[PDB]
Amino acid sequence: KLQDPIPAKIYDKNGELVKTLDNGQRHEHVNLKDVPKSMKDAVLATEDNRFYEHGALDYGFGSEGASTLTQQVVKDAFLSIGRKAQEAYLSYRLEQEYSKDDIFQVYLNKIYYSDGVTGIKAAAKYYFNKDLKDLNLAEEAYLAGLPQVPNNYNIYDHPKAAEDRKNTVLYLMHYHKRITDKQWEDAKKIDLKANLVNRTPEERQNIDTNQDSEYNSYVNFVKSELMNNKAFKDENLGNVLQSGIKIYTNMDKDVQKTLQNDVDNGSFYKNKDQQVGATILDSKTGGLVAISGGRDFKDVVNRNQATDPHPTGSSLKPFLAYGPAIENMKWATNHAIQDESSYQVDGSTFRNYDTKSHGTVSIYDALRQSFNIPALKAWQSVKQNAGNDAPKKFAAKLGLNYEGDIGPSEVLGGSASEFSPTQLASAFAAIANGGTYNNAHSIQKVVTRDGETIEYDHTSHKAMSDYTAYMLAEMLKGTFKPYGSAYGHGVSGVNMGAKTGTGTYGAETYSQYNLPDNAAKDVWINGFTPQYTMSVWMGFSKVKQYGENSFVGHSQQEYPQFLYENVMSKISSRDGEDFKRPSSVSGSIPSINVSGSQDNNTTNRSTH
DSSP states (O other): OOOOOBOOEEEOTTOOEEEEOOTTOBOOOOOGGGSOHHHHHHHHHHHOTTTTTOOGGGOOTTTTTSOHHHHHHHHHTTOOOOTTHHHHHHHHHHHHHSOHHHHHHHHHHHOBOSTTBBSHHHHHHHHHSOOGGGOOHHHHHHHHHGGGSHHHHOTTTOHHHHHHHHHHHHHHHHHTTSSOHHHHHHHHTSOGGGGOOOOOHHHHHOOOOOOSGGGHHHHHHHHHHHTTSTTTTTSOHHHHTTBOOEEEEOOOHHHHHHHHHHHHHOSOOSSTTEEEEEEEEETTTOBEEEEEOSTTOOTTTSOOTTTSOEEOGGGGHIIIIIHHIIIIIOOOTTBEEEOOSSEEETTEEEOOTTSOOOOEEEHHHHHHTTOHHHHHHHHHHHHHHTOTTHHHHHHHHTTOOOSSOOOHHHHTTOTTOEEOHHHHHHHHHHHHTTSEEEOOBOEEEEEOTTSOEEEOOOOEEEOSOHHHHHHHHHHHHGGGSTTSTTTTOOOTTOOOEEEEEEEOOOHHHHHHTTOOTTEESEEEEEEEOSSEEEEEEEEESSOOGGGTTSEESHHHHTHHHHHHHHHHHHHSOOSOOOOOOOTTEESOTTOOEETTOOOSSBOOOOOO
16 A cells, blocks of 8 residues: 655764665655645646545446546556456555545656656656746646656657647646636647757766765665664565665765775776775774775676675784784784794695795784784694684684684685675774774664664674783784885874785686786785774786786785775874773783783794
8 A cells, every 4th residue: 555755865974964865766756735736737637637526436347436546546556367457446445545635645756757757846847947836837738648648748759749638638627627718728829848958869868877976885785784674674675765764874974985086086906807895994883984895886786895705815814813822822922933934734835925934933023024824823823722613713703704614724815714895894993992893884773754763783792802902903003114014005193003915816727827926816905093994805807817807916916005095094083092002911012911921932033
């Protein structure tokens, strides 16, 4: 039974309107009291002159028991057995349960007027560039007539036909005594085409569906999260989005425009096939302030590449190796691990990216300049001292799950270590806020058509101890100091740290496609201040011969870092807020240890 489609409105963290989900569509809602008498008079004359009087028993099958006007509203909602008898009965029902105003209002809002226009208000703006108050009788007569058969009466294609339909409607208005002999006579002398908007046939078809395009990615996230609540996970998504709801979000309008403008206008693309995905969260709460799904992201046409999973490369070294060591065995940042030029785990050889050994290194130096081999050792040591599920458990509390056994490969970000920027941002935000985890969430509250304010909530619990969060925070500031993996892309004001990734190809792929030895496939920077967390991924829609669609060399692998720095430079607070130091730690970088747990296996050396 009927409803009055109004489209869903989205408000930002400040309750300012931002995006209405109307599409480009040519439709403007109008209340019944706001349509001029003469235009209502036109439609009744034309379609059912005794609309208000009529009841069922004033007599295809069913024809005479609803009014033709009601029946038009129902046909529409059905455009396969006996689908006209059904319309006839469904229409008797509507008249039993709604007023004639309710039905009239719906009719003036949904019936089609050709060329993509639904409802009378949009009709008058499109054809004559007029508000309803301004239409002359000829203009009204034609609009009353148009929708019986609208492609065949459209003035653009069929001028003669429109002229004769106008005349009929004027005739009927006169016949049903809704206009004087003197208006009828004046109305005939009017040229219908006088105010007809001058238009070419491409303009007739060009609807701009992609206005306010900087929000396209945000909107896509919201549609996915909207329906996860109790209230809605029974329902037709398309239906919900056309029933007056007001969604209030954690979007920051300005930060979202910055993000997407840089995604589109930046100079860090090698070619048309390079893709990107970015998510920015509020470190302290976990709220989605901005998201971007890629270059020129449109909603259903493109895959939102910030909610899709990707190989992670060295991005998880804090979570599956070094973090758990600090949490459980209580190692200092000073802690020494012996590096090798080759290391065997299970049944396989591993090497550092550069193929060299760097001596005995601190986990400080080994995290911040991202070494493979010592990371494997740290992991192995964890399994030997905290249990074989100790890495799994730690990742689990940070939203990073695995179905099978976490092997050496997934520690270096291969195999089943595929996660989304949004997932990784949430994990890193837990370092950035003293160690609590918040599932990424856009929605605060929804307000239904009629006030009933439905409430939202997010998975939120303790991830790590306070000392683990501080220690990792300060370790990962090093990634921006000389010889760090993001050396040169920091902001001079701001207390950020960061973990980069570089993901690779399998052996077969290098030879099949003749990739050079230094050709990478996925590249990330994960960064965070105490105010924002920002995770960026770039890869390529597909592999190409000789290296076209790879990040060949150090500086092609840096691309993500340029987006990060451009964006944080512009959105970060300048107060100089620092990470919150707890009383469970003592000393300072590179030599922070856990209070009352002196580490006995440490080194003094700096790698460069």
